[PDB]
Design a protein around this nucleic acid. Structure first.
Ligand SMILES: Nc1ncnc2c1ncn2[C@@H]1O[C@H](COP(=O)(O)CP(=O)(O)OP(=O)(O)O)[C@@H](O)[C@H]1O
Ligand SMILES: [Mg+2]
Ligand SMILES: [Zn+2]
Ligand SMILES: [Zn+2]
Lengths: 56, 263, 114, 147, 391, 133, 30, 43, 181, 65, 49
RNA sequence: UCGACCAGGA
């Protein structure tokens, strides 16, 4: 129950929530701190190659 | 005389009560905002601590120091540190103050805004001097000292606007009102029995005429004539809080018009 | 901690203009100016005076989010009137109006005995 | 939070210019939602405010003692004698436009408490980091920089 | 996380300041408030896992819920309170503001709609420019009380081609109701179309209300002087009605209705007369409250508050209960040491004759205190029992 | 572009059902006996009291965005005090030769019940309403 | 009077005198 | 701190409920919310 | 307070009289007659929860001690002194509360659990906790920069030293709908 | 704990006022309310500032080093 | 302002929490449940002071 | 770098 049916996980974040009327129904406001720690691993493809370099 | 007229009711060293005739609400309010935030003042914005034998936290005092009003007369003949070419500061962009305090007496020795003293060169311009509106000539108690309680600070005051920090606020509170008798119907007074008897009539009711019951609503009626009271904290004299409020707002509009010319 | 700098409310960033003039696809003789590092202090004011310009068909302004010092302004004019020329005219009138206020206030102030 | 189980966090912080003002140039330090009051039935919060309004004008300590002979009708009578609308309402003007707000706002002082739950002591993000020895799974708590 | 909806896929928007900011109408499915609630965020790592979220778990998809066969999210609080205010026939908007309202709709066609009134001043109706957020081909018909295709009360609802024809917009339209606008746009127009309608109603309603304002003071609990005497004598006539049934039952004349003692049967009558009392006393106040009553205006839109919320604040709190029965004798034959024994009166066994505005007597305060504690216990006791039931 | 209805009516009752700025007016035609009217009026900009001679006209025109002034030289098709714009939303057959048409001017409702103006009135939204005196 | 009966506000002088002599941690210490 | 030095603990018929006899001895409002509600008492 | 039928000069009355009440205050301004004084003079007594069962208590002294033979509509609906048999009188009903509940302004005008809630939050509020905060080496200490004593206060806050070491500030609260934030 | 410089709400320099406020109550035996308006404190935002402040600095000074 | 009434243990301010127990030497009669071979019971928690 | 108690949050 504690190790296999549910686990502690990476790529996770949690903070206090606040209401925004200038947000879209389907959006979520992500604090820059949090955006700067969490990461999506993107594969270097000719489509992104140039953008990705400017991020690196 | 010209476009929007003005009638000064009451005036003092720190309060101007006037009537803004022949204006749009937007303009009368834009002026309000400008006076609040967009006017530039001089305020302590660096507190270098040497010794603090005080009961009070260095930053408590540091915050407290900025909040002290300083002569901001000839502010416009001082560069914003950020625009000056020196590393950090100099006489062209900053006023340096020095505070030295020590409890010589057995009785509690107090530190006042008068006790700060200018060490930088003012180049012959009315700036830096802390505002003392105090009857006793001390003005603003920074903090208190016991026996050997020492306090040594160096303060750098720079140009800035209240939109960056409320310490650069040249104005206290701008009292603003239009249409005392609700003729424009810009409110629907909440009541229990009689709205008119429940709600107190403002002092401005004498400067306009009561509507007369049997008179239908003026759908064409528009609000010009705004009763205002600009209060100065001390940095800049009241007359200038208004005048600079008008020039700053003009400059903002001007920059837009000017930026449109580069395009 | 995640707090943006206060000067970001007025000091223009690296490569960022005060006015971004984009044409509006939706209606003819329409435009959308993005005013960077500005609030209702300028917004409501410019919008107001544009309404008096009888040759201006539509004028509205919005500050889409309060974290950001910037607002948009939509100007529509009668065919032949460049909406830029309409904004350019509206500013001058505000300036002249304010000039009169300064002039009128200065003179009436000098009259006081306190 | 107020002293009435009226807890909340800040949503946004506004400078004085964008804030709604009384004809006297007074502006609020804090803006709470009217929606709080009806379900909660926290009448004393409003009574605290009407009494604290009077207290600030009069410079007399407002007795908010429980079983007393102090009435909301009685407090109103004093506030009206101070030149304000008896039920604490005050006309307000919009910060952005300057146009009088169609509604009159219940405005006055209210004792508010700073609580120990500050966001920057909670805010946490972990995208791969320290692992438990045994289970080989993320560790527990922001303290240990866990997941 | 007791819902399919307790976890939804969202688009990121990198903003400053340390909180997770979220649209207010997605508050209900999460069951979140902003009194210091924290929320969890999970970042998918695969291009296929991303698709999983965006294609199944996304918020727009989660709008209509299958547990209730109705939409699990509608318009809430400020936007709901303000949508009623904006709608009603008396609300008219002049050109200067109408134009700002229209610009605010991100999907505005660029067309300034013809004003309802042209005559001296060209005025627009609240309904008129709200209908700018309502997309074409949306057809809705309601009929509430005396709604008559010419609803005099501005009752029910009629929206044809995404245009309001009559009636006020409140909870029964714009909320998470079965036949309401959301379930209709979601069905007829789509999930992403509805996710927009949400925002566009908000962008307009919120703006209008910012410039109209709304509040609540102690004046909203204050009931009329003669109405108060009327409430006070309603309690009195009901307390005299109790005394009657009490001294009659003491005189051994009462007859118990099956499956109950004379005592059990009597106690029902006491409880009944005192609850009838609170409710009619309460109704007098609601009825006496004007349409300007901010508290009434919130109950009206359905943004916050109900009848009983008015009743207890303005009129009277009423009977207190612990274990179903009125406050019983914890001490010997008396509820507190401030009473003589064998006292069965409203005051003795916890009847709160007073309103919250009026204030409570020390005994009333303590009895309310026992009844209130029962609430916190039941919320704590039966919360695990309910949880295990789900597991 | 043309007139669709005209008749001189007379008020019987003006009613503000919890409404401060508006009222529902009840009218009868002097021309035809079978003709009655019900109409919500903004009594703030056009105050109406019982027993008033009100010439009620309907008309199609005089469909694109709205232009505010310039009307100085434009044809102000209003030689009428009150002018509203709305939608025809119901065509009731109140039995025999009587037909009732329902109009909404953004919430401000209307119901004209009569006979002769069968042809004249169209279920087509585009309808103005002109009231003089 | 030395014999006149006490009022409502009078009770607070007794309460004043209670803590003046007892304190708040009274129980813990005793 | 004051309220901590005035706190009471109940270990282990209906103990969580505020009994009549608690009048003037224990505070009727000061109690924890849930799982210890009405067990932790305040004088 | 002990109530006695023994009052030659009339009916049944509270042993403690205006004399005693002033006698105490003299010792109060002198900052002889203490709390123990009323105890040894037998004007006040210690009642356990078991002994409480055999006594009859009046809430208010004055409001529950005379007789009878117009009224303010604003005040709350109260009960009579139909009891001839009064043995004791409650010092002050507001003493039923504990430290936390006693900081609540008008708790008699609130819904029962809303008080229970605040009787938890005030413990989680910042402020001055001791004046020697600067000479203590505790892990974590939160101190309010500028504390303000409240405007709305209890008669009971006096004894609790609250207005000397406060929990917050008297903020200018506007109950309005603004930007919807 | 030492008088705030400036009222939070409108920013009128309440800083200098303190010593003069205490002296109006002690010396001129004035009631708090009248004393407040004498220092020029008109709005209640400024009024609470002085009226409701608790000068803990004086306690802290009582500690020797 | 420090009231005391607690201890300093290894340089840590410890508070002893009051413990609610049922009184002793107290005579108490209670009724037994539906499936019980005993209908009522008299109990006494006899303890030396 | 290990896990037990206590105190808290929604
Ligand atoms: N012990 C517990 N276990 C699980 N969830 C809890 C919980 N206590 C609180 N919650 C969560 O918090 C929600 C409601 O609690 P709160 O938010 O503290 C009350 P509120 O909504 O702020 O005001 P209210 O008291 O007027 O409802 C619950 O629906 C639940 O999701
Ligand atoms: Mg919550
Ligand atoms: Zn320089
Ligand atoms: Zn102030």
């Amino acid at each position: 129950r504690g190790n296999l049916m549910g686990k502690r996980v990476d790529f996770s974040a949690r903070t206090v929530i606040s209401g925004d009327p200038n947000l879209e129904l389907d959006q979520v406001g992500v604090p820059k701190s949090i955006a700067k720690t969490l990461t999506y691993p993107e594969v270097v493809t000719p489509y992104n190659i140039d953008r990705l370099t400017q991020l690196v | 005389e010209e476009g929007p007229q003005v009638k000064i009711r009451e005036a003092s060293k720190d309060n101007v009560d006037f009537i803004l005739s022949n204006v749009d609400l937007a303009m009368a309010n834009s002026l309000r905002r400008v006076m609040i935030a967009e006017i530039p003042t001089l305020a302590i914005d660096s507190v270098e601590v040497e010794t603090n034998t005080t009961v009070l936290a260095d930053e408590f005092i540091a915050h407290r120091l900025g909040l002290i009003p300083l002569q901001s007369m000839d502010i416009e003949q001082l560069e914003y540190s950020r625009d000056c070419f020196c590393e950090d500061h100099c006489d062209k962009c900053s006023v340096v103050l020095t505070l030295q305090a020590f409890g010589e007496s057995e009785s509690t020795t107090n530190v006042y805004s008068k006790d700060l003293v200018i060490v930088s060169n003012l180049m012959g311009r009315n700036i830096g001097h802390p505002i003392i509106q105090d009857k006793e000539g001390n003005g603003v108690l920074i903090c208190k000292l016991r026996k050997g309680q020492e306090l040594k600070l160096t303060c750098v005051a720079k140009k800035g606007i209240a939109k960056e920090h409320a310490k650069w606020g040249p104005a206290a509170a701008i009292e603003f009102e239009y249409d005392p008798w609700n003729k424009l119907k810009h409110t629907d007074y909440w009541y229990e029995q009689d709205s008119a008897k429940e709600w107190p009539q403002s002092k401005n009711c004498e400067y306009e005429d009561p509507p007369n019951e049997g008179d239908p609503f003026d759908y064409k009626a528009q609000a010009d004539t705004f009763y205002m009271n600009v209060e100065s904290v001390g940095s800049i004299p009241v007359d200038q809080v208004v005048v600079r409020g008008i020039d700053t707002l003009q400059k903002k509009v001007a920059s837009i018009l000017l930026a449109l010319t580069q395009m | 901690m995640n707090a943006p700098d206060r000067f970001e409310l007025f000091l223009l960033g690296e490569g960022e203009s005060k006015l971004k003039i984009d044409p509006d696809t939706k209606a003819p003789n329409a435009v959308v100016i993005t005013f960077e590092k500005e609030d209702h202090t300028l917004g409501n004011l410019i919008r107001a005076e544009l309404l008096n310009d009888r040759k201006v068909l539509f004028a509205a302004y919005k500050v889409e989010h309060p974290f950001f010092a910037r607002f948009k302004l939509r100007i529509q004019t009668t065919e032949g009137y460049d909406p830029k020329d309409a904004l350019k005219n509206a500013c001058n009138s505000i300036i002249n109006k304010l000039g009169a206020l300064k002039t009128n206030f200065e003179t009436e102030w000098n009259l006081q005995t306190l | 939070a107020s002293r009435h189980g009226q807890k909340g966090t800040i949503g946004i912080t506004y400078r004085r210019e964008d804030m709604p003002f009384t004809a006297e140039g007074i502006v609020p330090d804090l803006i709470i939602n009217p929606h709080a009051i009806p379900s909660r039935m926290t009448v004393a919060h409003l009574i605290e405010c009407l009494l604290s309004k009077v207290a600030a004008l009069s410079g007399n300590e407002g007795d908010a003692s429980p079983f007393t002979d102090i009435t909301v009708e009685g407090i109103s009578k004093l506030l009206r004698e101070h030149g304000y609308q008896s039920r604490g309402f005050e006309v307000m003007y919009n910060g952005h436009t300057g146009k009088k707000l169609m509604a009159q706002i219940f405005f006055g002082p209210t004792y508010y408490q700073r609580l120990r739950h500050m966001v920057d002591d909670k805010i946490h993000a972990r995208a791969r980091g320290p692992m438990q020895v045994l289970t080989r799974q993320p560790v527990e708590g922001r303290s240990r920089d866990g997941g | 996380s007791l819902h399919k909806m307790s976890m939804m896929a969202h688009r990121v928007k990198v903003i400053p300041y340390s909180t997770f900011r979220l649209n207010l109408s997605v508050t209900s499915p999460y069951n979140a408030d902003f009194d210091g609630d924290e929320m969890n965020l999970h970042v998918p790592q695969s291009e296929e896992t991303r698709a999983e979220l965006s294609q199944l778990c996304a918020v727009p998809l989660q709008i209509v819920s299958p547990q209730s066969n109705k939409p699990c999210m509608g318009i809430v609080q400020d936007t709901l309170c303000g949508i009623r205010k904006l709608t009603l026939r008396d609300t008219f908007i002049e050109l200067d503001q109408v134009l700002n309202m229209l610009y605010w709709v991100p999907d505005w066609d660029g067309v300034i709609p013809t004003p309802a009134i042209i005559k001296p001043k060209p005025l627009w109706s609240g309904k008129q420019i709200l209908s700018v957020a309502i997309p074409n081909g949306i057809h809705l018909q309601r009929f509430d009380e005396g709604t008559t295709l010419l609803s005099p009360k501005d009752n029910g609802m009629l929206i044809i081609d995404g245009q309001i024809i009559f009636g006020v917009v409140e909870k029964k339209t714009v909320g998470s109701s079965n036949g309401g606008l959301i379930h209709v746009v979601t069905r007829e127009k789509g999930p992403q179309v509805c996710a927009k309608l949400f925002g566009n109603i908000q962008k307009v309603v919120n703006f209008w209300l910012l410039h109209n304002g709304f509040s609540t003071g102690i004046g909203d609990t204050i009931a009329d002087g003669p109405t108060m005497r009327e409430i006070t004598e309603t309690i009195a006539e009901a307390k005299k009605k109790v005394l009657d049934v009490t001294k009659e039952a003491q005189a051994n004349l009462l007859t118990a209705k099956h499956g109950m003692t004379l005592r059990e049967s009597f106690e029902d009558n006491v409880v009944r007369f005192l609850n009838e009392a609170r409710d009619k006393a309460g109704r007098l106040a609601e009825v006496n409250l004007k349409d300007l009553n901010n508290v009434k205006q919130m109950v009206m839109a359905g943004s916050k508050g109900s009848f009983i919320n008015i009743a207890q604040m303005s009129a009277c709190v009423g009977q207190q209960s612990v274990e179903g029965k009125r406050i019983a004798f914890g001490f010997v034959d008396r509820t507190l040491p401030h009473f003589s024994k064998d006292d069965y009166s409203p005051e003795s066994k916890g009847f709160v004759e007073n309103s919250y505005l009026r204030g409570l007597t020390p005994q009333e305060f303590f009895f309310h205190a026992m009844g209130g504690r029962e609430g916190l216990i039941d919320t704590a006791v039966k919360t695990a029992e309910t949880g295990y039931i789900q597991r | 572009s043309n007139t669709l209805f005209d008749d001189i009516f007379q008020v019987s009752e003006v009613d503000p059902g919890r409404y401060n700025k508006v009222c529902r007016i009840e009218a009868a035609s002097t021309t035809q006996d079978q003709c009655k009217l019900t109409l919500d009026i903004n009594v703030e900009l056009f105050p109406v009291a019982a027993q008033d001679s009100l010439t009620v006209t309907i008309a199609s025109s005089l469909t694109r965005s709205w232009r505010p002034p310039q009307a100085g030289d434009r044809s102000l098709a209003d030689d009428y005090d009150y002018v509203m714009y709305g939608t025809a939303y119901k065509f009731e057959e109140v039995s025999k030769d009587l037909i009732a048409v329902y109009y909404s001017f953004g919430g401000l409702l209307m119901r004209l019940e009569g006979n002769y103006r069968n042809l004249n009135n169209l279920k087509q939204e585009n309808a103005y309403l002109l009231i003089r005196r | 009077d030395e014999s006149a009966p006490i009022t409502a506000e009078d009770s607070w002088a007794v309460i004043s005198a209670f803590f003046r002599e007892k304190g708040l941690v009274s129980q813990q210490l005793d | 701190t004051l309220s901590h030095l005035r706190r009471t603990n109940t270990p282990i018929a209906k103990p969580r409920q505020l009994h009549n006899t608690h009048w003037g001895l224990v505070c009727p409002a000061e109690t924890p919310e849930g799982q210890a509600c009405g067990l932790v008492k305040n004088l | 307070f002990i109530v006695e039928d023994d009052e030659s000069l009339g009916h049944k009355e509270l042993k403690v009289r205006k004399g005693h009440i002033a006698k105490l205050m003299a010792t109060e301004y002198q900052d002889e007659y203490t709390w123990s004084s009323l105890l040894n003079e037998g004007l006040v007594e210690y009642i356990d929860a078991e002994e409480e069962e055999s006594i009859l208590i009046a809430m208010q002294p004055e409001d529950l001690e005379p007789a009878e033979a117009d009224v303010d509509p604003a005040k709350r609906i109260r009960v009579s002194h139909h009891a001839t048999t009064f043995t004791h009188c409650e010092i002050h009903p507001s003493m039923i509360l504990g430290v936390a509940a006693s900081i609540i302004p008008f708790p008699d005008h609130n819904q029962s659990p809303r008080n229970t809630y605040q009787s938890a939050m005030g413990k989680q509020a910042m402020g001055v906790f001791l004046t020697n905060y600067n000479v203590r080496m505790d892990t974590m200490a939160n101190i309010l920069y500028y504390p303000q004593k409240p405007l709305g206060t209890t008669r009971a806050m006096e004894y609790l030293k609250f207005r000397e070491l406060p929990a917050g500030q008297n903020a200018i609260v506007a109950i309005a709908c603004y930007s919807g934030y | 704990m030492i008088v705030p410089v400036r009222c939070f709400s409108c920013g009128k320099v309440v800083g200098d006022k303190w010593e003069s406020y205490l002296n109006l109550l002690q010396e001129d035996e004035l009631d708090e309310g009248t004393a407040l308006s004498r220092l020029g404190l008109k709005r209640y935002c400024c009024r609470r500032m002085i009226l409701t402040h608790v000068d803990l600095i004086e306690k802290f000074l009582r500690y020797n080093p | 302002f420090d009231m005391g009434g607690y201890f300093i243990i290894n340089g840590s301010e410890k508070v002893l929490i009051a413990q609610e127990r049922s009184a002793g030497n107290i005579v108490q009669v209670f009724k037994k449940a539906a499936p019980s071979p005993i209908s009522h019971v008299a109990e006494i928690r006899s303890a030396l002071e």
